Amino acid sequence: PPGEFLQVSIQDTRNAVRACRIQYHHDPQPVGREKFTIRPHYGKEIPCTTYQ
Amino acid sequence: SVSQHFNVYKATRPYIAYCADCGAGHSCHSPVAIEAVRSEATDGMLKIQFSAQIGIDKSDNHDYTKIRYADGHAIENAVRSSLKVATSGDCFVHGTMGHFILAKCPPGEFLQVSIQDTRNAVRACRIQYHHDPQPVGREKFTIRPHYGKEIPCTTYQQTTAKTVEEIDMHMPPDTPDRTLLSQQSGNVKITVGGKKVKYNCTCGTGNVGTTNSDMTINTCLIEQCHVSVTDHKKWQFNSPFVPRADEPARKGKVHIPFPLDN
Amino acid sequence: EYKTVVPSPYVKCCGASECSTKEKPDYQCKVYTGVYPFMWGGAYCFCDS
Amino acid sequence: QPGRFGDIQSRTVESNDLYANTALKLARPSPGMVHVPYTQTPSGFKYWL
Ligand SMILES: *[C@@H]1O[C@H](CO)[C@@H](O[C@@H]2O[C@H](CO)[C@@H](O)[C@H](O)[C@H]2NC(C)=O)[C@H](O)[C@H]1NC(C)=O
Numbered sequence: 001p002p003g004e005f006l007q008v009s010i011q012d013t014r015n016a017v018r019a020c021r022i023q024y025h026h027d028p029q030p031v032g033r034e035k036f037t038i039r040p041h042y043g044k045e046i047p048c049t050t051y052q
Numbered sequence: 053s054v055s056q057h058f059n060v061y062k063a064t065r066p067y068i069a070y071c072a073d074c075g076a077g078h079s080c081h082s083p084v085a086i087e088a089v090r091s092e093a094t095d096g097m098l099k100i101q102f103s104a105q106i107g108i109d110k111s112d113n114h115d116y117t118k119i120r121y122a123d124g125h126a127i128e129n130a131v132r133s134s135l136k137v138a139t140s141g142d143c144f145v146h147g148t149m150g151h152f153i154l155a156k157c158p159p160g161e162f163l164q165v166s167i168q169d170t171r172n173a174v175r176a177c178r179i180q181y182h183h184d185p186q187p188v189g190r191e192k193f194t195i196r197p198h199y200g201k202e203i204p205c206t207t208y209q210q211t212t213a214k215t216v217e218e219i220d221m222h223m224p225p226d227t228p229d230r231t232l233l234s235q236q237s238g239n240v241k242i243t244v245g246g247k248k249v250k251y252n253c254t255c256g257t258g259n260v261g262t263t264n265s266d267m268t269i270n271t272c273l274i275e276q277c278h279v280s281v282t283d284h285k286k287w288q289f290n291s292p293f294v295p296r297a298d299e300p301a302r303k304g305k306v307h308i309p310f311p312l313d314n
Numbered sequence: 315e316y317k318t319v320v321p322s323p324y325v326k327c328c329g330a331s332e333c334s335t336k337e338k339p340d341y342q343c344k345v346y347t348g349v350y351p352f353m354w355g356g357a358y359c360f361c362d363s
Numbered sequence: 364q365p366g367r368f369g370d371i372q373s374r375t376v377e378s379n380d381l382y383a384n385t386a387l388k389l390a391r392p393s394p395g396m397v398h399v400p401y402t403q404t405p406s407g408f409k410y411w412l
């Protein structure tokens with residue numbers, strides 16, 4: 001979701017919490033001409049790039 | 053009594069419907085499909101409707117710690133402590149009864165409901181709902197004060213008694229299944245499994261009808277037949293996402309809990 | 315406020331249907347031809363188109 | 364008129380007649396699905412509110 005900072009954390013062998021956080025301005029923009037948040041059950045199909 | 057209030061839900065079963073986004077932006081059939089969200093309460097008590105039923109166990113008996121849902125053709129159980137509703141943050145559940153969930157949630161753009169499966173899997177669906185409650189009065193506060201005025205302001209009550217408003221139910225349709233078909237050299241064999249099935253095969257002549265026992269059809273390929281369960285003695289909610297059976301006649305009506313009050 | 319009531323869709327395989335007008339507020343019905351519905355178990359009926 | 368105050372009307376709270384004009388238009392379903400779509404202007408009562 002949108003935010004200003006990003007954090008990744010795993011758990012140590014001793015069950016400690018190891019985390020490291022940086023700043024990253026994240027604000028996604030859906031493709032097309034509308035700013036929606038959840039996909040619809042009736043609409044069009046626009047070409048769009050993703051990571052496989 | 054509370055147990056007596058559950059007589060109506062004895063002739064109903066849950067269902068599985070198509071909901072667009074079920075967790076990771078991938079369309080998937082789910083038993084926690086959302087149908088409607090009602091916000092007629094002034095204080096902001098959301099009323100959520102979804103396929104799975106609260107308060108009923110698989111053996112059709114009252115119980116307050118089990119949630120029953122449809123999976124395949126049967127009905128399973130899930131723990132009620134594994135129910136979550138979130139709108140840009142975890143929100144609180146004020147009362148659940150049958151098809152409906154009552155919650156109050158912080159401002160957000162999307163709404164998500166999730167339950168845990170028998171195999172400890174997570175089933176969820178998310179829809180879009182612009183939620184922003186303005187408190188009654190002339191001040192946009194957030195938390196109740198310890199010195200203030202009393203003003204009229206409506207809400208949903210937790211009473212489970214009969215109300216005037218109601219929804220409608222209708223007979224479920226025939227549900228296709230492709231897993232009741234097996235190939236034996238040059239034959240196809242259908243497995244009843246305890247449920248009446250109906251078939252239609254174009255190989256040969258006179259291969260249509262409904263049976264409830266295991267049979268084999270010769271000189272037929274596996275792709276040349278189609279079968280579907282037919283018994284369906286229970287009831288289903290009239291949903292736009294599930295096809296309607298042959299009869300266009302309304303069959304039953306079921307009251308809906310949690311009326312409106314001052 | 316109004317609520318739009320929309321019942322479950324009627325699908326018929328290897329056939330056709332027509333709907334009749336009714337005295338009901340803003341009734342809007344239409345018949346769509348050449349459909350291939352899908353369910354979780356598989357296809358719904360034999361006839362392709 | 365649709366979308367403004369007075370989209371749906373009734374003579375009295377208990378009356379059984381209703382005049383509605385909300386521009387309910389149906390649309391053809393997406394292929395390989397079982398769903399009925401519709402586009403309809405939002406309630407004019409909320410707009411007036
Ligand atoms: C079983 O399936 C066959 C098709 O395999 C159906 O036969 C069709 O019937 C309609 C009218 O009833 C005709 O317009 C089609 O041309 C027929 N198709 C073929 C391939 O002949 C038959 O109706 C189905 N029967 C049931 C009970 O579902």
Ligand SMILES: *[C@@H]1O[C@H](CO)[C@@H](O[C@@H]2O[C@H](CO)[C@@H](O)[C@H](O)[C@H]2NC(C)=O)[C@H](O)[C@H]1NC(C)=O
Binds near residue numbers: 312313314
């Ligand atoms: C909460 O109380 C108010 C006022 O007592 C209710 O409004 C009245 O409801 C009665 C029906 O019992 C009507 O005959 C009156 O005409 C209503 N008042 C006005 C000014 O129209 C209100 O309905 C109650 N809330 C709920 C949910 O029943």
